[PDB]
Amino acid sequence: MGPGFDFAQAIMKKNTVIARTEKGEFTMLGVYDRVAVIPTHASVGEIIYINDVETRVLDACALRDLTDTNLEITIVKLDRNQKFRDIRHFLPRCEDDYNDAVLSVHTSKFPNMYIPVGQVTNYGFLNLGGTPTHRILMYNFPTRAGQCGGVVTTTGKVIGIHVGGNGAQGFAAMLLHSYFTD
DSSP states (O other), X not given: OOHHHHHHHHHHXXXXXXXXXXXXXXXXXXXXXXXXXXXXXXXXXXXXXXXXEEEEEEXXXXXXXXXXXXXXXXXXXXOOSXXXXXXXXXXXXXXXXXXXXXXXEOXXXXXXXXXXXXXXXXXXXXXXXXXXXXXXXXXXXXXXXXXXXXXXEETTEEEEEEEEEOSSOEEEEEOOGGGGOO
């Protein structure tokens, strides 16, 4: 409908796949080469389905901060025959608050879904499903099951992936440029 949705759509059309684990179907963001991200509660194993195709997982790392606190991001390298467009230059370098964000989802259940969530707070600490979690972003939208892995963007930045909600607020794990240096 406007330039927020334009940037979101550009990311969805080239940099997302549908990931299936034993814990469900997730929006999965591809970042560069064969490297993608997914919420850690997806419980990625040795094999994952990518757009309904059996795919070997070459590496999977559940990120934690330097205090050994959960960040709820898993970085996955996929045994895929094709690279993602490199979008690392759209990742923020530091923790921040944002205006006018969009949450975008693409699954078998919710295809081509875009939600204007508005203002995004650097919330920080969250007890997420019982697990102490850091670097959480919060938005005041009543997000539902089927949205986990959803991509949070502003115009020009890919800032996080959706990891949970409490019925009234939604929560994303930050994406930082420093997670994807090599």
